[PDB]
Design an enzyme around this catalytic site. Structure first.
Site, PDB file in Angstrom:
ATOM      1  N   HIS A  65       0.822  -1.221   0.000  1.00 27.68           N
ATOM      2  CA  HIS A  65       0.000   0.000   0.000  1.00 27.68           C
ATOM      3  C   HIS A  65       0.855   1.270   0.000  1.00 27.68           C
ATOM      4  O   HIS A  65       1.919   1.298   0.614  1.00 27.68           O
ATOM      5  CB  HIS A  65      -0.967   0.006   1.197  1.00 27.68           C
ATOM      6  N   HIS A  67       0.609   4.860   1.147  1.00 29.97           N
ATOM      7  CA  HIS A  67      -0.314   5.393   2.140  1.00 29.97           C
ATOM      8  C   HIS A  67      -0.615   6.873   1.912  1.00 29.97           C
ATOM      9  O   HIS A  67       0.317   7.677   1.863  1.00 29.97           O
ATOM     10  CB  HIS A  67       0.254   5.203   3.537  1.00 29.97           C
ATOM     11  N   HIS A 110       3.761   0.536   2.906  1.00 30.28           N
ATOM     12  CA  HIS A 110       3.873  -0.606   3.810  1.00 30.28           C
ATOM     13  C   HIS A 110       3.145  -1.826   3.253  1.00 30.28           C
ATOM     14  O   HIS A 110       2.240  -1.688   2.418  1.00 30.28           O
ATOM     15  CB  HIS A 110       3.366  -0.247   5.234  1.00 30.28           C
ATOM     16  N   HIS A 112       0.400  -4.435   3.138  1.00 27.92           N
ATOM     17  CA  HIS A 112      -1.003  -4.337   3.526  1.00 27.92           C
ATOM     18  C   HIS A 112      -1.648  -5.713   3.515  1.00 27.92           C
ATOM     19  O   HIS A 112      -2.835  -5.879   3.177  1.00 27.92           O
ATOM     20  CB  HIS A 112      -1.767  -3.352   2.645  1.00 27.92           C
ATOM     21  N   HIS A 397      -7.675   5.349  18.905  1.00 26.62           N
ATOM     22  CA  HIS A 397      -7.667   4.661  17.633  1.00 26.62           C
ATOM     23  C   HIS A 397      -7.431   5.675  16.506  1.00 26.62           C
ATOM     24  O   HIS A 397      -8.183   6.659  16.384  1.00 26.62           O
ATOM     25  CB  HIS A 397      -9.002   3.921  17.426  1.00 26.62           C
ATOM     26  N   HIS A 400      -8.119   5.702   9.437  1.00 23.75           N
ATOM     27  CA  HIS A 400      -7.571   6.081   8.142  1.00 23.75           C
ATOM     28  C   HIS A 400      -8.456   5.617   6.989  1.00 23.75           C
ATOM     29  O   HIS A 400      -8.928   4.490   6.981  1.00 23.75           O
ATOM     30  CB  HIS A 400      -6.174   5.477   8.010  1.00 23.75           C
ATOM     31  N   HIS A 402      -8.593   5.118   2.849  1.00 25.10           N
ATOM     32  CA  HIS A 402      -7.861   5.028   1.596  1.00 25.10           C
ATOM     33  C   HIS A 402      -8.465   5.909   0.529  1.00 25.10           C
ATOM     34  O   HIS A 402      -9.629   6.260   0.602  1.00 25.10           O
ATOM     35  CB  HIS A 402      -7.841   3.580   1.088  1.00 25.10           C
ATOM     36  N   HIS A 452     -10.021   1.864   8.157  1.00 21.20           N
ATOM     37  CA  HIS A 452      -9.660   1.044   9.304  1.00 21.20           C
ATOM     38  C   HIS A 452      -8.881   1.809  10.339  1.00 21.20           C
ATOM     39  O   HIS A 452      -8.383   2.905  10.065  1.00 21.20           O
ATOM     40  CB  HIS A 452      -8.901  -0.207   8.871  1.00 21.20           C
ATOM     41  N   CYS A 453      -8.806   1.237  11.539  1.00 22.03           N
ATOM     42  CA  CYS A 453      -7.863   1.719  12.535  1.00 22.03           C
ATOM     43  C   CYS A 453      -6.488   1.373  12.026  1.00 22.03           C
ATOM     44  O   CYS A 453      -6.253   0.258  11.576  1.00 22.03           O
ATOM     45  CB  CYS A 453      -8.094   1.029  13.879  1.00 22.03           C
ATOM     46  N   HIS A 454      -5.559   2.316  12.097  1.00 21.07           N
ATOM     47  CA  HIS A 454      -4.213   2.003  11.622  1.00 21.07           C
ATOM     48  C   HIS A 454      -3.311   1.347  12.679  1.00 21.07           C
ATOM     49  O   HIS A 454      -2.098   1.233  12.499  1.00 21.07           O
ATOM     50  CB  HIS A 454      -3.557   3.225  10.978  1.00 21.07           C
ATOM     51  N   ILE A 455      -3.891   0.923  13.796  1.00 22.13           N
ATOM     52  CA  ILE A 455      -3.154   0.035  14.689  1.00 22.13           C
ATOM     53  C   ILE A 455      -3.319  -1.330  14.029  1.00 22.13           C
ATOM     54  O   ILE A 455      -4.415  -1.883  13.986  1.00 22.13           O
ATOM     55  CB  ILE A 455      -3.680   0.030  16.141  1.00 22.13           C
ATOM     56  N   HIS A 458      -5.153  -4.184  15.386  1.00 20.45           N
ATOM     57  CA  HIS A 458      -6.597  -3.981  15.480  1.00 20.45           C
ATOM     58  C   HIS A 458      -7.253  -4.251  14.128  1.00 20.45           C
ATOM     59  O   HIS A 458      -8.362  -4.806  14.063  1.00 20.45           O
ATOM     60  CB  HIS A 458      -6.920  -2.593  16.046  1.00 20.45           C
ATOM     61  N   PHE A 463     -11.037  -4.449  12.778  1.00 21.66           N
ATOM     62  CA  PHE A 463     -11.519  -3.058  12.908  1.00 21.66           C
ATOM     63  C   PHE A 463     -11.445  -2.343  11.556  1.00 21.66           C
ATOM     64  O   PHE A 463     -10.605  -1.457  11.359  1.00 21.66           O
ATOM     65  CB  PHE A 463     -10.652  -2.321  13.945  1.00 21.66           C
TER      66      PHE A 463
HETATM   67 CU   LIG Z   1      -7.383   0.615  16.985  1.00 20.35          CU
HETATM   68 CU   LIG Z   2      -1.073   3.141   5.874  1.00 14.55          CU
HETATM   69 CU   LIG Z   3      -3.812   4.209   3.199  1.00 15.91          CU
HETATM   70 CU   LIG Z   4      -4.949   0.715   4.938  1.00 12.66          CU
END
Ligand SMILES: [Cu+2]
Ligand SMILES: [Cu+2]
Ligand SMILES: [Cu+2]
Ligand SMILES: [Cu+2]
Length: 495
Positions: A65, A67, A110, A112, A397, A400, A402, A452-455, A458, A463
């Site tokens: 991905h 980002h 990163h 994905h 949290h 993010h 896309h 999604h949460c970017h943790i 998670h 999530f």
């Molecule tokens: Cu989270």
């Molecule tokens: Cu990202």
């Molecule tokens: Cu992204």
């Molecule tokens: Cu993503």
């Protein structure tokens, strides 16, 4: 190192010891972090990713991905596994071929797929603006002024459990740092400055999880960019930076020649700076080569508050100036129970057929699409509002979206909405219990877009949902190369 915009990028396994502890890794471009991928606004990026992975412990499949890159017309190149593509298999390559019109600033890339980016596949991505309106505020902007913050784990991602509170074993700044426990005196990163010069520091969170309290002893920071969006100047003495966020800040090297601590305190893991954990070194040319002995201010007097940020451009806010003043306003129920996260009662589990392929194959509506209840369709050319009320197990949290950036109409720990001039960004903390962080954007990009949460732990715990934006126009807007169509047959055949 900088590569691109046309480049190879090999994905390999390597043992690395950034804190003195050797373990396996999945590396982009041979290094940790990955090499900086760079180009100018409007450039054509052609990244040939060669999957050469062998170590199954971290998965030998991969998907990358880019980002905060919108990927308009190239939804197929976005990277999220089983959303926009099947993973590339070991031994194959795949060309991420895309443009970045209208976008400049500090981004990243990163893995994905699953939690693979924790295992090392992460690096910075910078789009230079040859006509940067900020240019005159600094003397130096280059590879030496990129600062990445990374959480690093001694336990392989695939074995994390999950979830299940998970904590890092050190904080790495430009890829070096010391272990939280039984801290060994291993090499720290240095950032070198010259008395009287101003630097565009590009602060990148490449975190799988923690947020960081980032500061530099004795020095100010003037924020000028947030998640790719030029901002009006904002001088702070501390920056809480959440996972996957970016800031450019001007550093004015106006202190006496010497050594000053750079600090990044995570919200979990090792607390403090004993033995030089959570640390790197700001060294003036002319300083003795010695560790800094500086201290942080006992109280930071001008820490970043997100509601103090405003776009440099007249972005405004789409739609109407009251909650739900949108064409399609949404409020998501975000929950955690029994080790899994839910959005509107559904935990995300990746479908066998990527959401993009499903649409290309003939799917027309969210109801047609898998996973069930994990897709919300969006009409084209419509103002979207998304409220993301917090409360779900830790927290805070960083959500993010896309293929879009968005107006942060309401920020963390502040229940006053801003429909005049809030910052736009692509990843945002939804704060704490009782908060009601709210975002707005316009649907001008047909495709299935991940939220999604970017943790990452998670995300793997579910999530996430997909905004399937303008499903009827998705195939026509996003023509795919045969190599993309070859991905799922190769992947499914190998598994
Ligand atoms: Cu989270
Ligand atoms: Cu990202
Ligand atoms: Cu992204
Ligand atoms: Cu993503």
């Amino acid at each position: 190192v900088q590569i691109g915009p046309v480049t190879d990028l090999h994905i390999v396994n390597a043992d690395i010891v950034p804190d003195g502890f050797v373990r396996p890794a999945v590396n982009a471009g041979g290094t940790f972090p990955g090499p900086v991928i760079a180009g100018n606004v409007g450039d054509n990026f052609q990244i040939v990713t060669f999957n050469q992975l062998i170590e199954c412990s971290m998965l030998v499949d991969t998907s990358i991905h880019w980002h905060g890159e919108f990927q308009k017309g190239t939804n197929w190149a976005d990277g999220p596994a089983f959303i926009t593509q099947c993973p590339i298999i070991v031994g194959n390559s795949f060309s991420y071929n895309f443009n970045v019109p209208g976008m400049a600033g500090t981004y990243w890339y990163h893995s994905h797929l699953t939690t693979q980016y924790c295992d090392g596949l992460r690096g910075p991505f910078v789009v230079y603006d040859p006509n940067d309106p900020d240019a005159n505020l600094y003397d130096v902007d280059d590879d030496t002024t990129i600062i990445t913050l990374a959480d690093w784990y001694h336990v392989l991602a695939k074995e994390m459990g999950a979830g299940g509170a998970i904590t890092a074993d050190s904080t790495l700044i430009d890829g070096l740092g010391r272990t939280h426990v039984n801290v060994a005196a291993v090499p720290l990163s240095v950032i070198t400055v010259e008395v009287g010069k101003r630097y565009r520091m590009r602060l990148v969170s490449i975190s799988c999880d923690p947020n960081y309290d980032f500061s530099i002893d004795g020095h100010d920071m003037t924020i000028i960019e947030t998640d790719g969006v030029d901002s009006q100047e904002l001088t702070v003495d501390e920056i809480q930076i959440f996972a996957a966020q970016r800031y450019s800040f001007v550093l004015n090297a106006n202190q006496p020649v010497g050594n000053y601590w750079i600090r990044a305190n995570p919200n979990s893991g090792g607390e403090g700076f004993d033995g030089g954990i959570n640390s790197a070194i700001l060294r003036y040319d002319g300083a003795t080569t010695a560790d800094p002995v500086t201290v942080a201010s006992t109280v930071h007097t001008k820490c970043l508050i997100e509601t103090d940020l405003h776009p440099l451009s007249r972005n405004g806010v789409p739609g109407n100036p009251h909650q739900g003043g949108a064409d399609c306003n949404l409020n998501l129920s975000l929950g955690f129970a029994c080790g899994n996260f839910v959005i509107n009662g559904v935990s995300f589990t990746p479908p066998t057929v990527p959401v993009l392929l499903q649409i290309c194959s003939g799917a027309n509506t969210a109801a047609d699409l898998l996973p069930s209840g994990s897709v919300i369709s969006l009409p084209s050319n419509s103002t979207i509002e998304i409220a993301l009320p917090a409360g779900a197990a830790g927290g805070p949290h960083p959500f993010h979206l896309h293929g879009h950036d968005f107006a942060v109409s309401e920020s963390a720990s502040n229940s006053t909405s801003n429909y005049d001039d809030p910052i736009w960004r692509d990843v945002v903390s939804i704060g704490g219990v009782g908060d009601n962080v709210t975002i707005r954007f316009c649907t001008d990009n047909p495709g299935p877009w991940f939220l999604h949460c970017h943790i990452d732990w998670h995300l793997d715990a579910g999530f996430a949902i997909v905004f399937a934006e303008d499903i009827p126009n998705t195939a026509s807007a996003n023509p795919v190369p045969e190599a993309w169509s070859n991905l799922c047959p190769s992947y499914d055949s190998a598994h």
